[PDB]
Amino acid sequence: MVDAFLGTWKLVDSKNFDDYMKSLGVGFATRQVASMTKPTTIIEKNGDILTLKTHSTFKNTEISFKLGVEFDETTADDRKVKSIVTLDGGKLVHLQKWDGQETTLVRELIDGKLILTLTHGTAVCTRTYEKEA
Ligand SMILES: CCCCCCCCC(=O)O
Ligand SMILES: CCCCCCCCC(=O)O
């Protein structure tokens, strides 16, 4: 039920990403570079398995997961977390848990754009991605 999320997406707007990174303890030099990076996110499916790639000039990540099945993840900032991704209200909700901490990465399609909302602590970042042909 994931299908309009699938494809290649490019970052076209970012709000409060520094706040989000700082909440997670990312160092200032990394936050500089990340504030000027525009990743490409690729979301593909094969049966029940999704693969989500995030590519940039700085750092790259890739995860594969089944919806609703927990997986181990090592994040771009090197947190070792327990993750689960589900559909909720048509949104792709990714929850990461580590050391009793929790962050959510929520993706929603609005007017054909993919809106990624990142929440940790009180920090709320909104990143907008537009689809590549
Ligand atoms: C500081 C942790 C950053 C983790 C990944 C954030 C993802 C951002 C993105 O995909 O646009
Ligand atoms: C996977 C590309 C993400 C680029 C921006 C965020 C990097 C954050 C970090 O390294 O701590």
Beta strands in the chain (DSSP E): 7-15, 40-46, 49-55, 61-66, 71-74, 80-88, 91-98, 101-110, 113-120, 123-132
CATH class of 7-132: mainly beta
Neighbours of 47 (CB within 10 A): 6
- Nearest protein CA to atom 6 of ligand 1, as residue: 76
List the alpha helices (DSSP H) in 1-131.
Answer: 17-23, 28-35
The neighbouring-strand residues paired with 55 are 40
Resolution number, Å: 0.9
Does 77 sit in the ligand 1 pocket, CB within 6 Å?
Answer: yes
Torsion 96-100-101-106 (CA) sign: positive
Going from N- to C-terminal start, the domains of the chain cover 7-132
Does 106 sit in the ligand 1 pocket, CB within 6 Å?
Answer: no
The coordinates were experimentally obtained by X-ray
Of the candidates 4, 105, 10, the residue with the CA atom closest to the CA atom of residue 63: 105
